[PDB]
Design a protein around this ligand. Sequence first.
Ligand SMILES: [Zn+2]
Ligand SMILES: [Zn+2]
Ligand SMILES: [Zn+2]
Ligand SMILES: [Zn+2]
Ligand SMILES: [Zn+2]
Ligand SMILES: [Zn+2]
Lengths: 277, 277
Amino acid sequence: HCHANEYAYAKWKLCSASAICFIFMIAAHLLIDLTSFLLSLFSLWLSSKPPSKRLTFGWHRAEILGALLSILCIWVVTGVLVYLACERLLYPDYQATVMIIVSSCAVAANIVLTVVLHQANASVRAAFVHALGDLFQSISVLISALIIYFKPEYKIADPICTFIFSILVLASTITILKDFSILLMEGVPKSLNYSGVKELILAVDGVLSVHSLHIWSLTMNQVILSAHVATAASRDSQVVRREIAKALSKSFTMHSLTIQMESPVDQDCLFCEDPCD
Amino acid sequence: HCHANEYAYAKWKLCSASAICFIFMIAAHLLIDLTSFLLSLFSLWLSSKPPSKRLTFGWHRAEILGALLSILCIWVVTGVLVYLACERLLYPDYQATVMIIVSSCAVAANIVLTVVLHQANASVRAAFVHALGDLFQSISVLISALIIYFKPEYKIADPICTFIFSILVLASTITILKDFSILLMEGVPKSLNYSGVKELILAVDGVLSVHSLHIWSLTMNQVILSAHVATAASRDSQVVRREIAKALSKSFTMHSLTIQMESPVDQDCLFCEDPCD
Ligand SMILES: [Zn+2]
Ligand SMILES: [Zn+2]
Ligand SMILES: [Zn+2]
Ligand SMILES: [Zn+2]
Ligand SMILES: [Zn+2]
Ligand SMILES: [Zn+2]
């Protein structure tokens, strides 16, 4: 045959944040937040579906697609806030404490959303940064309000306040796009290393030359491995991988293995060579 | 060992469209169109790179990531044009033939961009729809101009003109997102069929029960196959797949095969069962 509660864990942790912004009707930004969540949550309902004929590996990956969307909804939001800050700069006419407690309530609220996403699921590490950004964005108008209120002589420190805080957003979203670009490109995941498994595999008896390895991954923790191995022709074949699986599954967890057990007649070729790093 | 000119074909066909909008400095929207292009082209330069250690399958898939971006740059563009049409509706003050030949030159120009992308590469079928949309968008202001100029009594037919033509954009971009959602989710590609290969494989002698098939695809024409097959224990194993490859490669083209040749002792399980369709 050659053969848990992390799923609803987020559904717990995520549905909360959806309600907070929902209950946050004390007015744009909030409405936009109320949109990213449910959809992203709805994606979390997708990965639960069983693998269908059209999607053989199943809807596992769909989470990231929802996640990667949430990120690009942050760039649009902050994209507006830089252009308006520019408009708020070029049209300098604007007029306080009224604009403080309306933000004094917001900043503390976003801490709630952020702290409950205390770092698993990608959507978690996707909605989290969406909130964190929305926090640092929120303190901009606050930390400015407690500045111009006391020092209204300038009243122009607010634009740069956003400008420096906008970068605090984008410089905090790259760390997630350095990763989700590797997933959608079928690259080796973070927690592993390409040569880190070749040697780890070459440490078994029958193997001769692991050629044409391919190890991509699904969302965050689902990894899939695939390779062709060369075995001692005098040695029995099936028994070897009968351990290699154990040899790998013991090393760490998998979601599907396919090993080919090619025979010791390979035309010693760029395709089954090596990655040139 | 168990072992063309389509690449630069687009680089030919794509660099052209990049120059046309570049040379189109006869004014914004043109600049946005220019930004979308080169990047997408730059992605086409990525897929040429050889497979590296971090990206085992290689940068083939990266094209789609660039492609899928171009699409979402269309929704943003048309997103602006519906809100402005709304603003152009709610603020009805606006005032002709001056606004005709400035568009009479545009519409015909977009035909050039579209016709040279006469339907291969995804980026082709990605930049194409980006242009086609930008055409139907362009005729809106034109077909309206030759209406209100002759019948200025209304001058309100222009908003709905965009509104109906905006849908002509989005209803033309879905056909590409029905597909590129299957690629990034590792689903079986269009040109194939899940059961279409099981039977096509089960038509060989040694095979007993192809279990745990997995057939996803890279960008458009690169397909990868992977499966475990059961063979007659009395029959020799390696010789079977020594044909199955031919049996499939003869059927159509591949980019990597991994077959496991499991033995006839499988615990007759949901995992190696079937996709429930
Ligand atoms: Zn799965
Ligand atoms: Zn091989
Ligand atoms: Zn080779
Ligand atoms: Zn390739
Ligand atoms: Zn098997
Ligand atoms: Zn099974």
